[PDB]
Amino acid sequence: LLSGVNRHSTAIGRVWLSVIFIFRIMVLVVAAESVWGDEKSSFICNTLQPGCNSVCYDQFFPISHVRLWSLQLILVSTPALLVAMHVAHQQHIEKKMISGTLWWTYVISVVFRLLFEAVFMYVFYLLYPGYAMVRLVKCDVYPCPNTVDCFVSRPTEKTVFTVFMLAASGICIILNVAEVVYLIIRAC
Amino acid sequence: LLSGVNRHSTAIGRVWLSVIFIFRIMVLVVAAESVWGDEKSSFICNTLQPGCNSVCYDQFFPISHVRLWSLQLILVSTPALLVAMHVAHQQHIEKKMISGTLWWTYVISVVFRLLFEAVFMYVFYLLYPGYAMVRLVKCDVYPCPNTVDCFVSRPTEKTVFTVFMLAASGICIILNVAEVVYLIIRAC
Amino acid sequence: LLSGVNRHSTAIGRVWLSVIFIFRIMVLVVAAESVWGDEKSSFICNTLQPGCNSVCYDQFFPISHVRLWSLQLILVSTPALLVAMHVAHQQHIEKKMISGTLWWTYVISVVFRLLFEAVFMYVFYLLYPGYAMVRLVKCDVYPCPNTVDCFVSRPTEKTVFTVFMLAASGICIILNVAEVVYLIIRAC
Amino acid sequence: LLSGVNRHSTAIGRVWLSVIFIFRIMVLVVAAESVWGDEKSSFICNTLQPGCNSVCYDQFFPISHVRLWSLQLILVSTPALLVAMHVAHQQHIEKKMISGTLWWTYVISVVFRLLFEAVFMYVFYLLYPGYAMVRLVKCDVYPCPNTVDCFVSRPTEKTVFTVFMLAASGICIILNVAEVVYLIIRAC
Amino acid sequence: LLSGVNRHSTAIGRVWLSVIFIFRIMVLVVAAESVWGDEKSSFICNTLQPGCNSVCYDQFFPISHVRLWSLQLILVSTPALLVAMHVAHQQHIEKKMISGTLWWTYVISVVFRLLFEAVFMYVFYLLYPGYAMVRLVKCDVYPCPNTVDCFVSRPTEKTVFTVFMLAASGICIILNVAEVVYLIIRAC
Amino acid sequence: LLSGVNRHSTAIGRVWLSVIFIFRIMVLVVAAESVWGDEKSSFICNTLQPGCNSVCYDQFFPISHVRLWSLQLILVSTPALLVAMHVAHQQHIEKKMISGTLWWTYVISVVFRLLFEAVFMYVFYLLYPGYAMVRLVKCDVYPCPNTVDCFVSRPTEKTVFTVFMLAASGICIILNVAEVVYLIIRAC
């Protein structure tokens, strides 16, 4: 399951990480179509050149925030689901017919989840510097003549939800670091 | 679960809070897309300047009422879900192998839920003073020249639903205060 | 549950009220988006003044019929759900460790359901006198100059569904009165 | 349930009526939004008069075929659900603490279902004489000047689905008559 | 269930027919709204005559491919559901209180499914000769003056999905013929 | 089920293939309507010729990426579902009244899944050479006069999702090859 447990997860990996993951899922669900639903259609530019709106939008939004967060959530949830599948497979094999391997697998899964969180946060920072979206953008790309003034839709609400998601991801990273440190200390 | 119980919840925290939470959930579901569905598209201004509608809408509606209430509900439901997860974890631990800690955790959860309710109500008051929405708004923000007359969509229905949601949240705050007071009195 | 039972509900409160409630729910579901889906967009007025359509629509439809009926259904279903929750709470308390209190609670719940039905019917009568909707409406409200001719969408179908819902609500009121009278007679 | 059974239903009331009801439900589901989805928006008239399209559509389609069939299905399913609820209530009463009364109740339920089928078919015949829909309609109603040429959307597909639904309803009426006759013969 | 079994179905009627039916269901689900969603709105003609688009579309598409395939699937699934209902009824009757009748019923059901498949394929061939859809169509029907050039939307994707569905239906017909032949041979 | 098991599946066919299949399903679900939803409507060309947009779109997108991936996923999942159905049928037959045949069936199923993956990847390469989509396309097809400049919607996001899906399919092909080799080695 999401942020799955393996009989080795501590309190900060069984109680808090699941809560944060569910919170992110719910926020993404309630903001996926309400806020970013009309990101393309409401996006208009101040020009008479045909086809300038689409090229400007693709220039300033290479990949939307909602879909980037969706990919991040899917890739974060993948290792936990893989660990759960492996545990079920091992149980089935034992029934048809070990703790250290499971412990190391869980540690590697937490490490990979932390790595995915960090790389997705870095990608988000690289694509969209800053936490705020501006109402007006200046675009100079073919076929738009010289520079044109395009207007983004709902910058303030998108900024609020971006702050929420970034804070949640930072909390997830901190909790993953704490979980890794606690497991290492307990093992030694 | 929503407004969860911990074997320590009284009648005013097990029977009434859950009913109010379900009522708020149902109202938000039946008003999320019906009323606020076309808040952006039906919103039009009396100008010929391109891009003025979007900037005016973002100026007068930094974050929509529906999404603000959704975030409030999610953050209110988070502590109860966390407490339920902790209780399940403790039961699993005891099975694999205490009342005062659970009591204090429940008290802290109720306090945090009350705090979230109060802070969200204060934020709603700060963003949107008053309980009523006007049909006509005067907007003077770039690129709109001087002052322009924008028209809101369905102000009366939104006012009615705002009154409903605010009354429900006030009842929730009162019930949380009563629950905290009753628990403190019973403990002492 | 909807029009819930408490081991004290008679034949006219266990068999007929539930059927009527389910009938109203199904009618509202099949008419919520099909008929009232384009109540705002198809609504057009005979003027060139920008922003007159929205103000006219808000003037003649302070709150749509579908959402008014939805609120009525939610508030009618609330007392039954509260009674069911209280019964479950009492059963849990007795298991962890009375008929007259349950009987009085059920009577009060039926009374409150009747009161909500009556008040919502009165509100519907006050907002929309008569059972029929006209195709043409004359509106004289700012910014529309003098009087303008607005045209409602699907008045006949909305009239038919209004007749259905009003008849169902009247049957509900009659059955609630009969249930209260029968319980009073049986008790005495 | 739909076309419910009461331990007294024969082969033509337990096996065939349920199949026909499910067939009608599936046809209505697959034709509700695909065919009649854009009945109002694609409906256009050959005039420059504002507001003529809506009045013409309301004149020629007082209530759409899909919603009429939905109401017919709901009212047909109501007596069976009521009988099932009564049977469950009687079983609960007997457990807490008769065949002829149940038999008469089932007979009355079948009679009422037949009556609803007949009255809805008659209403459909009265509102829409014939089985075919024409592409062109002549409308002379205020505010449209003199006579205007309105164009219906997808008349052929709607005619095909109307034929399907009418044939299914006729089969239902025949089967209900056969069930009543068979029960009367068996009883005597 | 879909392509149901009756303890008499062989390998080619229990393993392969169900797979083909599920494949057709999934293809229809993934192509119902994605491809044929905007068949009417994207359909435009090269004329200034009002109302010509709708009459041309109804002329060239009497009933859409998606809805024709949906009706075919419903009518194919009907006999299997009827047989399953009859088997359940017989089991209930025996519990309350034969193989040859069930065998003959299954044979008749397979024959009727084959007949429905063949008749629907013939109807599809009669309405739409060939397997390919052309981009341009010449339409000469009132009120369009003389001949007009209408343009179909997504002809290539619709051709691909038509080929898929026709191949699947042909495989279904072949498997039904094989099942009937195998049952006849085994019986004799 | 998806990438089903047959008691003969190894670790790389029970744990990893299922994870990759679920990842592809989730990516397709979250990108089906968000990215490719307005592929046709937002697609505009720089011409005044009516009907040129639709013919140009059909020329440059014979079948959309989302539906091609959906067909690929359905055809990949078909053999596993068929194998599961056959296993259930064999279990039912044995209950009513072998390992080598099941092993060979599983091997053939894996081979067919690999073949479908390879053929769909080759088809995708043939239809859309390269991994990137360009903003501007030059189209010269009737009725568009000479060459016209059409503009694609969201090329960068579609490129990102294409890279994701192609990488996932390549991983699936590699894992299928490894599974076949491992089974062959273990058998010999």
PDB file of N, CA and C in Angstrom, chain B residues 27-54:
ATOM      1  N   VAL B  27     -22.853  18.998   1.947  1.00  0.00           N
ATOM      2  CA  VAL B  27     -23.104  20.325   1.392  1.00  0.00           C
ATOM      3  C   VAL B  27     -21.998  20.716   0.421  1.00  0.00           C
ATOM      4  N   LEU B  28     -20.742  20.464   0.797  1.00  0.00           N
ATOM      5  CA  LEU B  28     -19.630  20.795  -0.086  1.00  0.00           C
ATOM      6  C   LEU B  28     -19.690  19.985  -1.373  1.00  0.00           C
ATOM      7  N   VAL B  29     -20.078  18.712  -1.281  1.00  0.00           N
ATOM      8  CA  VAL B  29     -20.186  17.881  -2.476  1.00  0.00           C
ATOM      9  C   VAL B  29     -21.281  18.403  -3.398  1.00  0.00           C
ATOM     10  N   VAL B  30     -22.443  18.750  -2.838  1.00  0.00           N
ATOM     11  CA  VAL B  30     -23.560  19.191  -3.675  1.00  0.00           C
ATOM     12  C   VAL B  30     -23.429  20.630  -4.144  1.00  0.00           C
ATOM     13  N   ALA B  31     -22.488  21.399  -3.596  1.00  0.00           N
ATOM     14  CA  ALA B  31     -22.283  22.772  -4.041  1.00  0.00           C
ATOM     15  C   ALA B  31     -20.931  23.019  -4.698  1.00  0.00           C
ATOM     16  N   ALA B  32     -20.069  22.008  -4.804  1.00  0.00           N
ATOM     17  CA  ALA B  32     -18.718  22.241  -5.306  1.00  0.00           C
ATOM     18  C   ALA B  32     -18.720  22.569  -6.793  1.00  0.00           C
ATOM     19  N   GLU B  33     -19.418  21.765  -7.597  1.00  0.00           N
ATOM     20  CA  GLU B  33     -19.447  21.959  -9.039  1.00  0.00           C
ATOM     21  C   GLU B  33     -20.718  22.620  -9.543  1.00  0.00           C
ATOM     22  N   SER B  34     -21.808  22.555  -8.781  1.00  0.00           N
ATOM     23  CA  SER B  34     -23.060  23.147  -9.235  1.00  0.00           C
ATOM     24  C   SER B  34     -23.012  24.669  -9.181  1.00  0.00           C
ATOM     25  N   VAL B  35     -22.513  25.227  -8.085  1.00  0.00           N
ATOM     26  CA  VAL B  35     -22.510  26.670  -7.873  1.00  0.00           C
ATOM     27  C   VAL B  35     -21.205  27.302  -8.334  1.00  0.00           C
ATOM     28  N   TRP B  36     -20.077  26.812  -7.830  1.00  0.00           N
ATOM     29  CA  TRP B  36     -18.771  27.363  -8.158  1.00  0.00           C
ATOM     30  C   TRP B  36     -18.157  26.731  -9.399  1.00  0.00           C
ATOM     31  N   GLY B  37     -18.939  25.987 -10.181  1.00  0.00           N
ATOM     32  CA  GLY B  37     -18.392  25.360 -11.372  1.00  0.00           C
ATOM     33  C   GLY B  37     -17.973  26.361 -12.430  1.00  0.00           C
ATOM     34  N   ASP B  38     -18.811  27.362 -12.684  1.00  0.00           N
ATOM     35  CA  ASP B  38     -18.565  28.363 -13.714  1.00  0.00           C
ATOM     36  C   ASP B  38     -18.260  29.723 -13.099  1.00  0.00           C
ATOM     37  N   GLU B  39     -17.518  29.722 -11.990  1.00  0.00           N
ATOM     38  CA  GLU B  39     -17.138  30.978 -11.353  1.00  0.00           C
ATOM     39  C   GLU B  39     -16.200  31.794 -12.232  1.00  0.00           C
ATOM     40  N   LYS B  40     -15.355  31.127 -13.018  1.00  0.00           N
ATOM     41  CA  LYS B  40     -14.362  31.826 -13.824  1.00  0.00           C
ATOM     42  C   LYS B  40     -14.901  32.167 -15.207  1.00  0.00           C
ATOM     43  N   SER B  41     -15.617  31.232 -15.833  1.00  0.00           N
ATOM     44  CA  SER B  41     -16.083  31.442 -17.199  1.00  0.00           C
ATOM     45  C   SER B  41     -17.239  32.429 -17.274  1.00  0.00           C
ATOM     46  N   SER B  42     -18.190  32.354 -16.341  1.00  0.00           N
ATOM     47  CA  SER B  42     -19.317  33.280 -16.366  1.00  0.00           C
ATOM     48  C   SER B  42     -18.902  34.668 -15.900  1.00  0.00           C
ATOM     49  N   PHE B  43     -17.766  34.766 -15.219  1.00  0.00           N
ATOM     50  CA  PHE B  43     -17.250  36.049 -14.769  1.00  0.00           C
ATOM     51  C   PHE B  43     -16.777  36.871 -15.960  1.00  0.00           C
ATOM     52  N   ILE B  44     -17.448  37.995 -16.200  1.00  0.00           N
ATOM     53  CA  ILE B  44     -17.133  38.871 -17.322  1.00  0.00           C
ATOM     54  C   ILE B  44     -17.046  40.302 -16.818  1.00  0.00           C
ATOM     55  N   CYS B  45     -16.253  41.115 -17.507  1.00  0.00           N
ATOM     56  CA  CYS B  45     -16.101  42.521 -17.175  1.00  0.00           C
ATOM     57  C   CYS B  45     -16.543  43.393 -18.345  1.00  0.00           C
ATOM     58  N   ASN B  46     -16.821  44.657 -18.043  1.00  0.00           N
ATOM     59  CA  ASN B  46     -17.292  45.615 -19.043  1.00  0.00           C
ATOM     60  C   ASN B  46     -16.119  46.402 -19.625  1.00  0.00           C
ATOM     61  N   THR B  47     -15.294  45.706 -20.402  1.00  0.00           N
ATOM     62  CA  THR B  47     -14.139  46.318 -21.039  1.00  0.00           C
ATOM     63  C   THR B  47     -13.803  45.566 -22.316  1.00  0.00           C
ATOM     64  N   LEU B  48     -13.054  46.234 -23.191  1.00  0.00           N
ATOM     65  CA  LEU B  48     -12.554  45.621 -24.413  1.00  0.00           C
ATOM     66  C   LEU B  48     -11.085  45.235 -24.314  1.00  0.00           C
ATOM     67  N   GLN B  49     -10.441  45.516 -23.189  1.00  0.00           N
ATOM     68  CA  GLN B  49      -9.035  45.194 -22.999  1.00  0.00           C
ATOM     69  C   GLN B  49      -8.849  43.689 -22.853  1.00  0.00           C
ATOM     70  N   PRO B  50      -8.038  43.050 -23.692  1.00  0.00           N
ATOM     71  CA  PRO B  50      -7.795  41.614 -23.526  1.00  0.00           C
ATOM     72  C   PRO B  50      -7.020  41.321 -22.253  1.00  0.00           C
ATOM     73  N   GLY B  51      -7.367  40.199 -21.624  1.00  0.00           N
ATOM     74  CA  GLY B  51      -6.699  39.768 -20.415  1.00  0.00           C
ATOM     75  C   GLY B  51      -7.174  40.420 -19.138  1.00  0.00           C
ATOM     76  N   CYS B  52      -8.148  41.328 -19.207  1.00  0.00           N
ATOM     77  CA  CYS B  52      -8.616  42.012 -18.007  1.00  0.00           C
ATOM     78  C   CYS B  52      -9.497  41.121 -17.138  1.00  0.00           C
ATOM     79  N   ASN B  53     -10.267  40.216 -17.748  1.00  0.00           N
ATOM     80  CA  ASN B  53     -11.143  39.346 -16.968  1.00  0.00           C
ATOM     81  C   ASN B  53     -10.351  38.466 -16.010  1.00  0.00           C
ATOM     82  N   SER B  54      -9.268  37.852 -16.490  1.00  0.00           N
ATOM     83  CA  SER B  54      -8.513  36.928 -15.650  1.00  0.00           C
ATOM     84  C   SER B  54      -7.835  37.651 -14.494  1.00  0.00           C
TER      85      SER B  54
END
